[PDB]
From Swiss-Prot:
The active site is at residues 65, 108, 162, 165. A deglycosylated form may be linked to monoclonal antibodies to produce immunotoxins exploited in cancer treatment. However, a point mutation should be introduced to eliminate vascular leak syndrome, a side effect resulting from endothelial damage. It comes from Ricinus communis. AMP binds at residues 65-66, 106-108. Glycans are attached at residue 5. A carbohydrate binds at residues 3-5, 10, 35, 126-131. Changing residue 61 to A/M: No effect on the toxic activity or the vascular leak syndrome. It catalyses: Endohydrolysis of the N-glycosidic bond at one specific adenosine on the 28S rRNA. It comes from the Eukaryota. Acts as a glycosidase that removes a specific adenine residue from an exposed loop of the 28S rRNA (A4324 in mammals), leading to rRNA breakage. As this loop is involved in elongation factor binding, modified ribosomes are catalytically inactive and unable to support protein synthesis. Can inactivate a few thousand ribosomes per minute, faster than the cell can make new ones. Therefore a single molecule can kill an animal cell. This is Ricin A chain. Changing residue 59 to A/M: No effect on the toxic activity or the vascular leak syndrome.
Amino acid sequence: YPIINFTTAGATVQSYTNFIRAVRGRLTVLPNRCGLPINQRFILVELSNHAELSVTLALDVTNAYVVGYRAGNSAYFFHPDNQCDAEAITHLFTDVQNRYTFAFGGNYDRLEQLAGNLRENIELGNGPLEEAISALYYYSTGGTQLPTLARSFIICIQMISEAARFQYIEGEM
């Protein structure tokens, strides 16, 4: 799948905007989602920060949302909504050693609930994203608690998935 890169290190409004434009350009918003061959159903977004840590998010081209991610030798996936997506996600990060699928989904309502007290009005920005990237990475080694992971997913989704969707829709007036 096509890979799009972005780093928070030395990030500017211009680098962030070109990044979102690249994602928007690979989208094909549709009502349903089994209507596309698995070979062109996803877009990979590799994020890296100041500590040089890197994680790769898997975005669904039909809605722009995150279905899962990779951090080193481990991959995590939100609970799939149906069978197309279930078997579809088995085609992501096939060379990774460890694979795990959460019992919960990646929708805002679930994430907000999991974020519990930890986050009441999540702050967005280059700084929060920098920290979110580290949280997602360390989750694979036991240094990230669930509420923190949830908060981090929300930051990535709002700053990437949602930003791309918004621009796509405003594009078609």
